[PDB]
Every structure is written in structure tokens, then in C-alpha cells.
């Protein structure tokens, strides 16, 4: 059990051995591209970067660099692509990379300021009366509606490709209360905000894979989605006992560096799935309580 686990590592208080082990076993494999010359402002942090095996190349004939990576899993069938939080000479090239990928959904798990400083740029339109066109992607994109809640807003969002006239729905789950390096609230507003993806189709193998971004892309972005992951190999098998969430956040990062940024993420993660579990199981008036927990309105 990970609950076995989670109370032995608690009792021992080894959060951060745990930790240290995992951050020294992750892989490490080269980021080539990332580090070309030309891709210099293309990246937010000079110490996250894109693997070159998992990057996500944009179509362009120009240069197709774009701090993104698929995190690609395997046995639990599901696809996200991390990137960093678009800068302001990068959103035309995220919005061409939701375009070309076929993604219906973008969750944000950061703010545009964070800490007296600009995390992410403004990619997207706060005002339906004023759209955003990128020209160097040949896109435009327009706020439709937005529901505002408590600690999150979820967007709808049209993107249309000018090229081709063609026009997409996107939808945008923006976190507004998750602490860089910190860990949500509780794990109830964590897995309502969690369930609100899922129960969207965003998270659909019939769409391309949900891009997911934190301002690296990398610490409260692991955090998503390795409890997103882990809840979905138990709900497989309805075997909660069959997941180990330490080799699972292994397995994620083969794709991209550094998921998971703190020992108290990795220990939110255990909780996270642990109660989510409860659901999995058969027990969805949990579901409710989330809701409630959460004091979303
Ligand atoms: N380590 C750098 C870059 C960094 C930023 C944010 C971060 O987490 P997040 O993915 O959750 O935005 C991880 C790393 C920083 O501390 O400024």
C-alpha cells in the first residue's frame, strides 16, 4: 500500500531522503536542442529544459523549439504535455503547438505574477471585446465565457487557425491558488479542480494531449499530473494496491527533468491519490465532498 508507506516514511519523518532518492535516480538525458544558441529566449529557466527524446517540435519550417515535452505513459494510456509558461516572444509558438498537437485543454497551475515577478505571460484574452492574434503563428484566439470560481476559472476559449479559417474550442482550467514550490490547499480543492479536467473530455484519448503548465512546467505540472496518472493505473484494475507512486514519478520523468519540485509536493501526491482513491473504489459521494471542501463558489 502507499498508504503503509505514506504512514512509515511519515513516522519517520524521511520525506526528504525519499525525496533525494528520487531526484538521484531520475534520468537525465540530453537537451541539445534546448541549449542551442538560438533557443536561448525561448526558455524561461536556464535549468529546466525540454529532453530532445520528448521534446514537442512545432511545424514550422523555421525553428521548431519550443520548451515542451510529451510525457508519454505507457500503461496508463495517457498523454500530457508539460511546457514552461509561455514568454512573451513564445505564445504564438504554445498556441501553434495546441493547434498542431490537437489539444482541447490547457491547465494552468500558476499565475501570471507570482512573488513580485512575471511567471508567465498574458497568452491568452481576459476580454472577449479584445481577441489576440500571434502573426508569426497565424492565429487567433478569443475569450467566449469564463466561469470564476473560488480558488480556479475555467475558460472557454476559440482558437482559430487564420490559415486554414479553421476554429477550435479550447478549454482553460486555471489554478489561481497553488504556491510555487508549495502544494495546494488540501487535497479536496486539489482533486475537485482535478476532476473538473477530467470530466470535460479534456483528458480524452480522442483528443491530443492536454497541455499542462506551471511557470517551469515542471513542479506543481509533476504534481498534476502524477496523481492524474497514478488514479488512473489503479482505475484500470480498481487495485489501488497495485500502484507504486515513486516509480511512477520515475517513469514520468524519462519524459522531462525535474517533476516534482519539493518533498512536501511528492508527500501532497500520496494524499492526493490516497483520498482520490476512495472514488475509484465505488465511494463517488466523495466526489461531493471535494466540492464542498473545496468552497469553490
Ligand atoms: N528552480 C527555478 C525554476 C523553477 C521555477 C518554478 C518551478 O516550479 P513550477 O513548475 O511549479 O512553476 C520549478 C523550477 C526557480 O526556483 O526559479
Known amino acids: 500500500e502507499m498508504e503503509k508507506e505514506f504512514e512509515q516514511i511519515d513516522k519517520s519523518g524521511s520525506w526528504a531522503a525519499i525525496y533525494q532518492d528520487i531526484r538521484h535516480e531520475a534520468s537525465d538525458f540530453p537537451c541539445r536542442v534546448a541549449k542551442l544558441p538560438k533557443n536561448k529566449n525561448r ?3 536556464r535549468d529546466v529544459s525540454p529532453f530532445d527524446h520528448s521534446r514537442i517540435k512545432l511545424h514550422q519550417e523555421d525553428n521548431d523549439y519550443i520548451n515542451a515535452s510529451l510525457i508519454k505513459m505507457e500503461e496508463a494510456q495517457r498523454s500530457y504535455i508539460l511546457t514552461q509558461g509561455p514568454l512573451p516572444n513564445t505564445c504564438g509558438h504554445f498556441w501553434e503547438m495546441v493547434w498542431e498537437q490537437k489539444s482541447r485543454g490547457v491547465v494552468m ?10 511567471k508567465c505571460a498574458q497568452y491568452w484574452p481576459q476580454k472577449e471585446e479584445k481577441e489576440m492574434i500571434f502573426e508569426d503563428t497565424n492565429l487567433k484566439l478569443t475569450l467566449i465565457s469564463e466561469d470564476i470560481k473560488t480558488y ?3 475558460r472557454q476559449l476559440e482558437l482559430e487557425n487564420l490559415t486554414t479559417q479553421e476554429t477550435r474550442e479550447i478549454l482553460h482550467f486555471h489554478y489561481t491558488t ?3 514550490f508549495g502544494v495546494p490547499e488540501s487535497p479536496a480543492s486539489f482533486l475537485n479542480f482535478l ?14 494531449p492536454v497541455v499542462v503548465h506551471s511557470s517551469a512546467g515542471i513542479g506543481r505540472s509533476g504534481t498534476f499530473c502524477l496523481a492524474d496518472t497514478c ?3 489503479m482505475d484500470k484494475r480498481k487495485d489501488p494496491s497495485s500502484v507504486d507512486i515513486k516509480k511512477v514519478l520515475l517513469d514520468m520523468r524519462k519524459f522531462r527533468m525535474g517533476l516534482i519540485q519539493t518533498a512536501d509536493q511528492l508527500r501532497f501526491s500520496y494524499l492526493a491519490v490516497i483520498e ?3 472514488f475509484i473504489m465505488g465511494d463517488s459521494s466523495v466526489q461531493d465532498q471535494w466540492k464542498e471542501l473545496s468552497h469553490e463558489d
Open 231 to 233: 488514479l488512473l493505473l
Open 195 to 208: 476532476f473538473k479536467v477530467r470530466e470535460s473530455g479534456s483528458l480524452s484519448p480522442e483528443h491530443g
Open 109 to 118: 497551475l500558476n499565475r501570471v505574477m507570482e512573488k513580485g515577478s512575471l
Open 43 to 45: 526558455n524561461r529557466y
Open 152 to 154: 480556479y476559472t475555467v
Open 276 to 278: 482520490g482513491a476512495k
Open 178 to 180: 497553488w504556491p510555487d
